[PDB]
Amino acid sequence: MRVLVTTWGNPFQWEPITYEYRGIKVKSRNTLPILVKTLEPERILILVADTMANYYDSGKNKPEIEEKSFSSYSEVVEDTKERILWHIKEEVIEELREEDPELAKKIENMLKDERITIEVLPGVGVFGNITVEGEMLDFYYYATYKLAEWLPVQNNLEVYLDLTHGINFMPTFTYRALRNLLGLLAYLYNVKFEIVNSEPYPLGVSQEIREDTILHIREIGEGVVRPRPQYSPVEGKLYWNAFISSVANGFPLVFASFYPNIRDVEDYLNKKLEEFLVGIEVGEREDGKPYVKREKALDRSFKNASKLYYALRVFNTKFQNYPKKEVPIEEIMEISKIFESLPRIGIILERQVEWLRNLVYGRLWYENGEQKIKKGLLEIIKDKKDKRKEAEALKKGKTISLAEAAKLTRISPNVVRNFIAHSGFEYNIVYVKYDRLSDRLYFFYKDKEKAANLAYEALLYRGEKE
Amino acid sequence: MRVLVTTWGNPFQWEPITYEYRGIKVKSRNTLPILVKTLEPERILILVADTMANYYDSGKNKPEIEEKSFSSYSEVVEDTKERILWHIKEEVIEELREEDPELAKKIENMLKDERITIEVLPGVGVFGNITVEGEMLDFYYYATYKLAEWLPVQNNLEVYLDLTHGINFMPTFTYRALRNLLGLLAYLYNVKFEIVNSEPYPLGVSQEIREDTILHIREIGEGVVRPRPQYSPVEGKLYWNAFISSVANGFPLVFASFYPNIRDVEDYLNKKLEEFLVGIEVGEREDGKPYVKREKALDRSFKNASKLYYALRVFNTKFQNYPKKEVPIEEIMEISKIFESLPRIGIILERQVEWLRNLVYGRLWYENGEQKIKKGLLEIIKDKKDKRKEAEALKKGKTISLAEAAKLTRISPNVVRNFIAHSGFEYNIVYVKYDRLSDRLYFFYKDKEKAANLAYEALLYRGEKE
Ligand SMILES: [Zn+2]
Ligand SMILES: [Zn+2]
Ligand SMILES: [Zn+2]
Ligand SMILES: [Zn+2]
Ligand SMILES: [Zn+2]
Ligand SMILES: [Zn+2]
């Protein structure tokens, strides 16, 4: 699938110009036509700022919507959308009817379906049409949230990000939010991330020099996305962080054990978001214009939470039985196969995980043509002769330590390091239990709290240099 | 140390406004004053684009420099600097004499020393003062080069990046180039990376509403920099890539063995750069204005090379005996201590490296109060009785394999994976040699070519998911 995300400033300030891209040339005020014609996206998200609210050009009498008086940020948002929607219908499409009539119908139809959506984000700025006061980071944090909801979850996803019409701080914020999110999608699926940006609109030049000027849509993306560990906690959410640490460092047992319920996070976002919107005062400037003042701000936890929200949407398409406190070696392998995307960690897990597979089944290997082997908890439990207290306890279904498991067969003072080294599989805290009804060996954290803290700590952990 | 990097568009279009930041409020057309006053940087790099060349406002008669005719990109660059330098002396400082006279002298003096430097980068744009044609990425690639030269190499470095006056594509490109470079500095030294960005200049509003508007300098940085593996090769430079792979994955032997000579890369940059500038045609538009046309473009290798250039400046402050083909276990530990910054890899190395330290010295450890031990190549070579052919060959100073070394004591079909797993320490290709004059065990790659290829491959390597 191919999707396009594009940041827009003030569309009513752009004049018609010809855009070139991959051999194709389409004239418009917006890049959208050339991008839709060249790329043929299946979806399009348009990001604008509430600083667009109430905009009106008296000399060009556009957009053809009256200036209003607002009382809630709710109206402010819907009004902004109305005007941007107008520029799209009454200008983008309209003016295409004389340049590429088929494209106009294509954009016209995409606008019918829910192919293209406009979203209004919190901005900053004192303009002739409105004044918006608040924290700048709000745009960024909310951006991460919006992308967290809209963004697809599929294999071979191609995300094109057009920063052409982005105006102040918008570009970098959106670029950062998007690469963070796509970086999480890359743990399971393949995805390309391209950034497009057209050359600058010719300024202060003769009408003759402006008509010979054709703007190139440039590709400046990073290409194939590689997953990247994001050490981004959510204040006051131990378990979540523990899970966040597992996706960052690769802790299979911690992954399954603290897998958060997407609705629990989804509702955290909802509450924090509601507390934000309500802090938004909607008044009136000296000159009668709208005055939006945010007295509450979003924090990085809201951003990290939003990130967690997208990760879970990516993972939930492959794991539904989690959280699970007692997981079998089979699922540990599944979970471990996720980090294959991050070679260094997946390779660390493959060995560590095979070892754990050997505990349960036994180890069959060769040394110089010779043929040596060892049995696992599985066999020991069957053999009626084994009277070793560990196998005794295990045979009854009693809980046995991972170290105790190392004894029935063959297998530092800085807990965090060792915990990182062992991928969360500490022989002190990881236990085993045999269930006869299901007929399987289960691994689990006996000490729920300390497993999470050790995990959490391994997210904030930083080696020593100086 | 504290340094500031700030992107500028067209300074002659900005009007005076009051800037607030960390409780401090300074009025100017530029953010530089407020940033110098609040931060007190020891250095300042100002990034501008050649699209500033020949700029002149007829109504404000500024800058007070004539429009010229150019024949070489060399003049174009020096002229741009002249005008930006002018805005700084005749406006920034000048207008401060009536707002904060002490600050003016401070900026005046910093301009005397080489505290602040202006650099001209390749831009894109058709303007009333000049037309610049070329690839947009050139700004980005050259940016990475410029930062590679200017940027300091020290512990506790604080880089502030002001994107406030950045205009089109400049911000994101500079943000990306800077985080890549700082990310390499973080392998050895601590460094903070903050991004500052002022709120938007009030547009289309009454003179009364504009005077009540105070712009906030906002901090939107990432804070403490964490080193990040950069899989960025340089086409046609096997050895370099092998070294690049070692800094990315953590291959101590590969690090010391293919350590490139900084001058060899420095000269690669010089040649590629010269071939770029020479492709820059400097002509004249229909309207008499300057016409800069780049017929040659920089490629990502130039960027990656520039990155390699900065990494070497960071590493050269701690390693001068490299490249070294025969390195002792002592240096392997030094090299290994670098990745302590990236916990997951450093922890992988600590074990793998201690093992290699045990080969040379022997392993002294305890099992249940009991006291077992083994001897290393060191001791075996001393003991006159050992007649084992391996110790025999070794005692004569003959080359022995790492596997052969595993035998004299105690210690898949996908070569790349295993090579990654073993951190480049394959028992097949890593050899040992004892030198009696120096009295030390040396590890080395017998097959120079294949060690580099396997390394290189491990940079392009990607696990399997679907
Ligand atoms: Zn013409
Ligand atoms: Zn209030
Ligand atoms: Zn341990
Ligand atoms: Zn007033
Ligand atoms: Zn030519
Ligand atoms: Zn192997």
DSSP string across B171-189: HHHHHHHHHHHHHHHTTTS
* B-chain residues near A163 (CB < 8 A): 169, 172
Confirm if A16 and A213 have CB atoms less than 8 A apart: no
Count of positions (residues) in chain A: 466
Tokens for A212? 């010979």
Q: Could you count the other beta carbons within 10 Å of the beta carbon of residue B16?
A: 11
Alpha-carbon distances of A383 from A376, A402, B58, B211, B259, rounded to whole Å: 11, 20, 98, 88, 57
Q: Which residues contact A278 (CB under 8 A, 6 or more apart)?
A: A296
- One-letter-per-residue 3-state SS of chain A: CEEEEEEECCHHHCCCEEEEECCEEEEECCCHHHHHHHHCCCEEEEEEEHHHCCCCECCCCECCCCCCCCCCHHHHHHHHHHHHHHHHHHHHHHHHHHCCHHHHHHHHHHHHCCCEEEEEECCCEECCCCEEECCCHHHHHHHHHHHHHHCCCCCCEEEEEEEEECCCCHHHHHHHHHHHHHHHHCCCCCEEEEEEEECCCCCCCCHHHHHCCEEEEEECCCEECCCCCCCCCCCCCHHHHHHHHHHHHCCHHHHHHCCCCHHHHHHHHHHHHHHHHCCEEEEECCCCCEEEEECCCCCHHHHHHHHHHHHHHHHCCCCCCCCCCCEEHHHHHHHHHHHHHCHHHHHHHHHHHHHHHHHHHEEEEEECCEEEEEECHHHHHHCCCCCCHHHHHHHHCCCEEHHHHHHCCCCCCCHHHHHHHCCCCCCCCEEEEEECCCCEEEEEECCHHHHHHHHHHHHHCCCCCC
Tokens for A214? 């054709």
Q: Which residues contact A386 (CB under 8 A, 6 or more apart)?
A: A380, A392, A395
CA distance A340 to A336: 8
CA distance B171 to B175: 6
> Helix or strand or coil: residue B401?
strand
Sheet with A327-328, side-by-side order of all strands = A327-328, A440-445, A430-435, A400-401
CA distance A416 to A453: 10
Of A105, A86, A82, A94, the closest CA to residue A36 belongs to A105
- At what angle are helices A137-150 and A300-315 packed, to 10 degrees? 10
> Helix or strand or coil: residue B458?
helix
Confirm if B56 and B67 have CB atoms less than 8 A apart: yes
Amino acid at site A157? L
Q: Is B12 on the interface with A (CB under 8 A)?
A: no
Q: Which residues contact A102 (CB under 8 A, 6 or more apart)?
A: none
| Dist. CA A455 → ligand 2 center (Å) | 41
Q: Provide φ and ψ at A369, rounded to 5°.
A: 65, -20
CA distance B6 to A433: 60
CA distance A199 to B430: 52
Residue with tokens 């939010």: A177
Residue with tokens 């910054």: B341
Sign of CA dihedral B14, B16, B17, B20: positive
Largest Cα span, chain B: 98
CA distance A242 to A459: 8
Query: DSSP of B198-211, one letter per residue?
Result: EPPPP-S--HHHHH
By what method was this entry solved?
X-ray
Q: Is A299 on the interface with B (CB under 8 A)?
A: no
Omega of the bond leading into A63 within 30 degrees of 0 (cis): yes
How far from the centroid of its chain's Cα atoms is residue B420's Cα? 24
Tokens for A153? 């979850």
Task: Using the CB atoms, write b or e for A10-47: b if 16+ within 10 Å.
Answer: bbbebeebebbbeeeebbbbbbbbbbbbbbebebbbbb
* A-chain residues near B136 (CB < 8 A): 197, 199, 216, 218, 220
Tokens for A416? 């965090």
Task: Using the CB atoms, write b or e for B269-279: b if 16+ within 10 Å.
Answer: beebbeebeee
Chain B's closest residue to A169, CA to CA, is B197
Amino acid at site A316? N
A387 burial (CB, 10 Å; 0-12 / 13-18 / 19+) is: exposed
Q: Which residues contact A263 (CB under 8 A, 6 or more apart)?
A: none
| Dist. CA A296 → ligand 2 center (Å) | 10
> Helix or strand or coil: residue B195?
strand
Sheet with A131-133, side-by-side order of all strands = A125-126, A131-133, A290-294, A280-284
Alpha-carbon distances of B359 from A20, B305, B330, B405, rounded to whole Å: 63, 37, 12, 7
CB contact under 8 A, B226 and A226: no
CB-facing half-sphere around the CA of A70: CA atoms within 13 A = 29
Residue with tokens 């744009």: B125
CA distance A167 to A178: 17
Q: Provide φ and ψ at B22, rounded to 5°.
A: 45, 50
CA distance B420 to B228: 17
- One-letter-per-residue 3-state SS of B129-166: CCEEECCCHHHHHHHHHHHHHHCCCCCCEEEEEEEEEC
A112 vs chain B: nearest CA distance in angstroms? 32
Q: Which helix (H) or strand (E) holds B443?
A: strand B440-445
Alpha-carbon distances of B50 from B39, B137, B293, rounded to whole Å: 28, 14, 11
Q: Which residues contact B232 (CB under 8 A, 6 or more apart)?
A: B244, B300, B303, B304, B307
Confirm if B108 and B93 have CB atoms less than 8 A apart: yes
CA distance B349 to A417: 12
Query: Structural domains in chain A?
Result: 2-299 (3.40.50.10640), 300-466 (no CATH)
| Dist. CA B75 → ligand 1 center (Å) | 27
CB-facing half-sphere around the CA of A258: CA atoms within 13 A = 29
Confirm if A244 and A233 have CB atoms less than 8 A apart: yes
Query: DSSP of B320-374, one letter per residue?
Result: -S-S-SSEEHHHHHHHHGGGGGSHHHHHHHHHHHHHHHHHHHEEEEEETTEEEEE
* B-chain residues near A348 (CB < 8 A): 344, 348, 421
- One-letter-per-residue 3-state SS of A93-129: HHHHHHCCHHHHHHHHHHHHCCCEEEEEECCCEECCC
Q: Which residues contact B321 (CB under 8 A, 6 or more apart)?
A: B331
Chain A's closest residue to B155, CA to CA, is A466
- At what angle are helices A300-315 and A262-277 packed, to 10 degrees? 150
B residues 312-351 closer than 8 Å to A (CB): 337, 339-348, 351
B residues 415-434 closer than 8 Å to A (CB): 417, 420-421
Of B14, B4, B8, the closest CA to residue B35 belongs to B4
Q: Which residues contact B208 (CB under 8 A, 6 or more apart)?
A: A286
Omega of the bond leading into A323 within 30 degrees of 0 (cis): yes
Q: Which helix (H) or strand (E) holds B85?
A: helix B73-87
Q: Which residues contact A449 (CB under 8 A, 6 or more apart)?
A: none
* A-chain residues near B466 (CB < 8 A): 155, 188-190
Residue with tokens 């009540």: B212
Tokens for B79? 């002229």
Q: What is the dihedral of CA B92, B97, B102, B103, to 10 degrees?
A: -10
* B-chain residues near A137 (CB < 8 A): 218, 220
Q: What angle do CA A31, A37, A40 make, to 5 degrees?
A: 110
According to DSSP, the β-strands at A116-121 and B2-8 are: unpaired
- At what angle are helices A343-361 and B343-361 packed, to 10 degrees? 70
Alpha-carbon distances of A66 from A63, A80, A87, A130, B395, rounded to whole Å: 8, 12, 14, 14, 94
Of B344, B333, B307, the closest CA to residue B255 belongs to B333
Alpha-carbon distances of B234 from A1, A2, B242, B261, rounded to whole Å: 31, 30, 10, 15
According to DSSP, the β-strands at A191-198 and A157-165 are: parallel
Confirm if A145 and A273 have CB atoms less than 8 A apart: yes
Tokens for A59? 């000399």
Confirm if A95 and A258 have CB atoms less than 8 A apart: no
Q: What is the C-alpha radius of gyration for chain B, rounded to an integer number of angstroms?
A: 28
- At what angle are helices A300-315 and A170-185 packed, to 10 degrees? 30
Q: What is the dihedral of CA B90, B96, B98, B103, to 10 degrees?
A: -130
Sign of CA dihedral A333, A335, A338, A342: negative
Q: Which residues contact B383 (CB under 8 A, 6 or more apart)?
A: none
